[PDB]
Each structure stands twice: as C-alpha cells, then as structure tokens.
Amino acid sequence: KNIIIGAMTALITPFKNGKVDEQSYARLIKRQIENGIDAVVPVGTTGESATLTWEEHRTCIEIAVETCKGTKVKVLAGAGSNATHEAVGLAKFAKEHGADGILSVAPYYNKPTQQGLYEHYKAIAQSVDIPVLLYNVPGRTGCEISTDTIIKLFRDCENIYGVKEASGNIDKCVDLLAHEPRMMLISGEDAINYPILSNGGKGVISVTSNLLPDMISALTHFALDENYKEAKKINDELYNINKILFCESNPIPIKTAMYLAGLIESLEFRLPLCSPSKENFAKIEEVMKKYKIKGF
Amino acid sequence: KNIIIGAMTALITPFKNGKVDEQSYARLIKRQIENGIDAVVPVGTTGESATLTWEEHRTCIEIAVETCKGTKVKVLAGAGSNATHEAVGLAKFAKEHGADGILSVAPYYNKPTQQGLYEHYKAIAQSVDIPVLLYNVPGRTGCEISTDTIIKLFRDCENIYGVKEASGNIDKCVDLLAHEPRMMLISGEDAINYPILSNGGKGVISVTSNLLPDMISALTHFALDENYKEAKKINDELYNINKILFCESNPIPIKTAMYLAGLIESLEFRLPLCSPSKENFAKIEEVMKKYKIKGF
Ligand SMILES: NCCCC[C@@](N)(CC[C@](N)(CCCCN)C(=O)O)C(=O)O
Ligand SMILES: [Mg+2]
Ligand SMILES: [Mg+2]
Ligand SMILES: [Mg+2]
C-alpha cells in the first residue's frame, strides 16, 4: 500500500475580519516544514471544517498543496463528511488538486451502523486512487469504527491504509495491530502519542504541533527510530501543554495559544466556536511559558 | 411566549429511486394529521437531515407547510446545523416559507462550549420572529446544552420557548422545570414520554408516532389532561416497540417498519445509512405484529 506516515499537523485555519487569512495559512505551513514535520492535514476538526464554506475548504487544500510542492512534505487532505456523497466529492477534489492522500472522519451525528461505515468508506476509497486514512473520534462523532470494520476495510480496499485514532483506548490500539500488523495506526491524541508509537503506531496527526512542531516531530522521529527513552521524555515534557490544549474544545485552546505566541494576527473563530473563558485564557498562557516556541 | 407543544412527529423522509418521494411525503403528513398529531417536524435526524441536499431540505419544509394549511397542525421545521451561519440560513428560510417554528439541534461534531452554544442560539433566535425549540441529543452531537445554558437562552431570547431532550436524564428534566417552570420541556425519547410529561413536560417529538401516531397522540393528550393512569398505560404498552425502533441507529428501524407496514414504497436510505441486518429486519416485524397500525 501507498502510505502517508510520520509527524503530521492538523492545521489551524486562521481568520482575519471573518475571512480565511490565506497568506497566514501558507506562512504557518512553511513554519511546519522548517521544523521537521512530515505531512500537513488541512481542514480537519482542528481546521474548523464544520464552519468553512465549500469554497474555503477547497482553497485551504489548494494552499497546502502549493506551499508543500517541491519540499517532500506531504498533504493528507481533510476530506470527511457525514454524507457519503459529500465525502466522495471532497475526496475527488483532493485527488484532482494534487493532495497526496486523504483523511476521512467517521460520519458525525447520523450514527451509521458498522455495515454503513463499511459502505461509506468503500465508496470513498473506490472514488480515488490515492491513500485513504480512516479517522475514529467517537467523542465527537457519536459512532465508533470497530476494529473489525477497520481491518475489513484495510484488507478489502487497496488504498485504505490505516486509521487515526482519537479514542483514549490503548486496548483498541493493541487489538488493531495485534490482528492486522500491516496497517498504519496514527495517533490522534497528543497526550498519548508516545504509547501509540511504542506499540507500533507509525505517526501522529497533532494539535500541539501547530504550536511546537519541532517537539512533536522530534518525539515521532525518536520513536520511529526506536529511541523510546527520548520519545517518552518529550511526551512527558509535553503532557502539561497537551492537556491544557483541550481545556476547552479543540481548536479553541490551540488557536488561542497561536495568537498568544504572535503566530496569527487575530483570535477569531466561526460560530459556534468562540474565544475561551478568561480563566482558561490565563491557564493556556501560563502553561505555554514553560515551552520554547519557535518563531517564523 | 408563542409555543408549539403537544404530540409531534419527527417525519421520516421517503426516497424512491434515489430522490425524495414528494407525493409519499405529503401522504404521510396527511396520515399524521388524521391521527391526532399536533405538529410535524420535517427534516430532523429522523428525516435524514445530514444527507439531504439544501434543495431537498427546503422542499420537505414547503411540503409540510402546504400540507398542514387549513388544519390545527403546526410545522416545527428542522433547522439546526453545526455551523451557525447554516443554522441561521435555515431558520430564515423556514420563517419566510411559512413554518410555525423551528427545531434547532445543538451543533454536532465541533463541540461548542456553553458560551458558544449561547451565542449560536442567540444568533438563530435573533434572525427570525417565530418560536425556536432547542434540541439536546448528546449521544449524537458530542455536546450537551447544560440546564443553565438552556435556562439562560429561554430567559434572554424572546422566541426560545423550550427544549427537546433526548438525553436519558430525568434528573435534568426535574432540574429544568424546577428552576424555570415556564419552559416547554419536550420529550425526544419515546420510551420515557410519560415520565417527562408527568413532570410537567408539554409534548413529545416522536419517532414511534411515524408508525403509531394515534397511540402517541392519545398518550400525550391523556397526560396533558393529567389522566396519568391512561397515559402511563399507553407508554407501558409502547415500551417494546419504542425500544426495538432503536435496535439500530434511528431512522433505520422506523423506516424499515414503515416499509414493512406498506406505508412507504421503497426501503431506501442515503449512505452512510443503510438497511438493517436481516436479523433486525425480522425482530422489527415481530414486534410490529403486537401493535395496531393505522393505514392511510
Ligand atoms: N467543510 C465544508 C462543509 C461543512 C458542512 C457541514 N457544516 C454540514 C454538513 C451536512 N451534511 C449538511 C446537510 C445540509 C442539508 N440538511 C450536515 O449538516 O449534516 C459539516 O459537514 O460540518
Ligand atoms: Mg521527514
Ligand atoms: Mg475482535
Ligand atoms: Mg476537544
């Protein structure tokens, strides 16, 4: 299988005066490239996929592809939807506009059955010839892609190559790689990046790496190189910021931190997201001061 | 406050050859009207809102409005979204095309904070002059509108008049009506329709009423008259069908039941929804044989 692995960043989407700040978006991606990241994920949850227009969603994928051209950093485009026809449309757009692969979240809100998830992802995978990474995040979607469904999809669909797990369930991570060791398990939960990698996971799709790309990429590369002592050391050092970045729903804390570090111009969200409480604003700033934050 | 209460139905959306079967939709609404239902909810979760196009979503609202003219029956249009700008657009469409009010589900997938939920619903409520019913269903959305947030919205926004609860939490139902007894608490969970009404809830938005509208209407109206013995008896009789209609994710069982009773022509869903397992198909039919199902 063709794969996209390693240290990857779920890119925030900066807004300025209610619009995507496209120059800032490109500048943030260049900063990721300069700090050892292996791939970027435009317009995931962290990128406020729910509130972008179709035009903005397309535009962010295009900026990621164009900014990474000639750098060997890959683009794993956010392409999921809770409507299969929408997810297929996004997959085809990503393929036709030069993405290296797609990330495709389990359908949210309408709670498909395992049979429905299988048919959903089969339709998506049959619509493109680029790698497809499943994405399980039951706390946000209301459904779980079971281990059996993930493994069947990996075995039945040639371009489905693994899953990004954001489920707080290291037992399931063992289950997955004990029964199907050929798949690429990707951490979608920063606090437990190292335990997932040490069990044979092959990368991360990170929130924290927006702010600390050098640290997350180093953690991942230490682990893939089997230097588990140094990967664990970074995972331990990052625990405090990894947790504070979820004191309110992602990406409210990470965008706040990026604004506090001077990396984006305006602390703007699209409703229903909004700025954090004054108390959490202060907690985020306090935890950030313990870390060296790379500039541009 | 202007209110929409009583026995209400979350309408299924029938498809035939991949398109909304508009004549069937109108016929199903007339069947609800003739069996004592007080309001219909086009294009909620049960109506597969996630997978309808915008044009189909608009069309279903219009068919409901047109079909209810000249009757007591109100149209509480499904108008929620996880993007505030989409929810405002739907609210304004429903208002301008003659809906009596709107149902507005809490944003799914992006997990807004309570502050964000307040700002979301404030924007929706300020955009129209028709009643707005909140809708809390954390198992599908990944977030909870807290009692405090619901109560603030009811007190601060003229048109927000209550909430449809689908949370399996009678303690919260007590909390709501003990601290704000003027709100309209609406059951969004058929199995516990009677306990919610007997605590002072004033209606239901029902899945089961698609199949058994006369029974749900009788239950509700007995309860509203404090004829609790009769209301409880119907609630108890309905428990088995109320549970089997969730043996797979709603609306897979209810659409299957409507097909099994000859009330729709084709058992078609939009992916990622799909037909139930053959075993659940048989279980649904067996439970259906225990109930008296009105025709057209
Ligand atoms: N990334 C750009 C598009 C975002 C669209 C949407 N807000 C809503 C998606 C939708 N399937 C639209 C249904 C429209 C008709 N009811 C949903 O709300 O479920 C989402 O997927 O989060
Ligand atoms: Mg590299
Ligand atoms: Mg097993
Ligand atoms: Mg979060």
Ligand SMILES: [Mg+2]
């Ligand atoms: Mg401080």
Ligand SMILES: [Mg+2]
């Ligand atoms: Mg038409």
Ligand SMILES: [Mg+2]
């Ligand atoms: Mg009328």
Ligand SMILES: [Mg+2]
């Ligand atoms: Mg309280």
Ligand SMILES: [Mg+2]
């Ligand atoms: Mg009476």
